[PDB]
Amino acid sequence: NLDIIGKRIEKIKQEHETSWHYDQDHPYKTWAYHGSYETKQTASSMVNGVVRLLTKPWDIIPMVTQMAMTFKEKVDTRTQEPKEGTKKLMKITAEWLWKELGKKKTPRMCTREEFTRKVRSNAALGAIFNKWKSAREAVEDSGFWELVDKERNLHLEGKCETCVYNMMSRAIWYMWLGARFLEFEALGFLNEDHWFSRENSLSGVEGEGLHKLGYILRDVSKKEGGAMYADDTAGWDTRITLEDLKNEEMVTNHMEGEHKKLAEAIFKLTYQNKVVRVQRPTTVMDIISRRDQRGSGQVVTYGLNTFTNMEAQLIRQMEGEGVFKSIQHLTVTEEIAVKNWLVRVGRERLSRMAISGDDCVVKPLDDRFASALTALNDMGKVRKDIQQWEPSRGWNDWTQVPFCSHHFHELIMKDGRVLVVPCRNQDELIGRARISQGAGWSLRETACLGKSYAQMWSLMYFHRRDLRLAANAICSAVPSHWVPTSRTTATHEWMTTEDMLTVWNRVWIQENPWMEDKTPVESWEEIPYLGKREDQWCGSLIGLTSRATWAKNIQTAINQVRSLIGNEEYTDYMPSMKRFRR
Ligand SMILES: [Zn+2]
Ligand SMILES: [Zn+2]
């Protein structure tokens, strides 16, 4: 409590002395409330005109058009302390898991240099605008780094002054760039050095890419076992316990010298104790605190979500296999059995999972896993959209399993080679590509974002008739040499000015470990589509009059956009498809 957060609270109090008031009508039960001060301010979703003009049939599809229009009673909830048996299972599993992850990796500090390069090609390192305009400016100014130095020496002293969250099933906690640097300095190694790669962690998929995830799920399928289970947690971040935060902090046991102390301070001062400012319209700024739940940078959140999810799913697998009888209390011989299970089969059991933060797929030894719920419920990882004690419904077809918002199709090329391709409802793909975020987009920047979506579709979603055609239309409508952009940057091989067929060959043939025959593909016509009925099942408009007219008259739509952008160098990509190839 207040001895760790008081300095932070006291500093905010004194910057708003003409405002500070201990409000009585405060809406907090589960958060500690400390006081309020005077403020007033608010970013909606804007439409990408280049993508919309080239996807006219979708202008009358509500699932697309509604995406561009327009719980915080989940953040104000409180998870119960797990039983002693649950706490023991988690501590033994976490200790074993950090050792496995660290066998072939060395924890290390991330550098001002690495941080500087990051800001200077835009990663979403959720910072705030204000003493400098942007992050790009602060990073060049030596005053900033003296502010970083002050706080850093405070963290070595076991104290914190400026590491405060700003709050804005979602909730995003920005800190100032200084706080984010110190987080990145101490814990950036987890992402930067790929601790959650599939090579290193066996369950993880960090850095694997949407063209690899389907092949990974198919490899899990080839294990002897029962169904595939893919249970979502209801509000994962809100269900992270103080016990979870303490098992995560054990990564510091693998560290040394200064790094060890810097990492311990991030865990102690910013994760296990938190200070947050929230805008209330009644407009006052509330300064509130709590010990539990997830509130880190999005990239550290991803790695620690993956770790604690891997831990929770190994414990659920232990319960299914009868390694322990009750969560109330582990006997001495049950502890030795849990330890022995981990040593003996732990790595095999990790290989049976695919885990991406809070998202998992598990192929357990058998279907006893379906009803093994006491540990999972007692850890607070309560399943979404199913009654607390109802057995999980598993999948018997790896092509049906949901993972990272996708399902995966097995697609045989005319030459017999096998592509395992990512897919989702096509209304979701078109509806997302029609949205831009933020203000001051030039026509050129809007066109270059359209091109980024077009290139992503050609690489990942080439098997969807509507998207291959729309991609070629967008690429034909945007100047050939203009560089694709995004504003929040899986591996993004579509972000390039290289010929996308050369990129398709590198990703799907040359660099694909599941493809033994490395014969290059010479044209887009060698590259197959889903069955027409499967394409309709996954949202295609093939067969509709609106879609037929759009396809037939596509050069008229391309010419409309070219006329808006003006007299530039364009390429006609439409003859890469049979029907336009004369
Ligand atoms: Zn601090
Ligand atoms: Zn599909």
Side-chain angles (χ1 to χ4, degrees), residues 151 155 160-163 270:
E151 256 282 72
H155 286 178
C160 188
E161 195 186 83
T162 67
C163 304
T270 67

Side-chain angles (χ1 to χ4, degrees), residues 407 409 423 530 538:
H407 60 279
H409 294 258
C423 196
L530 294 185
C538 293

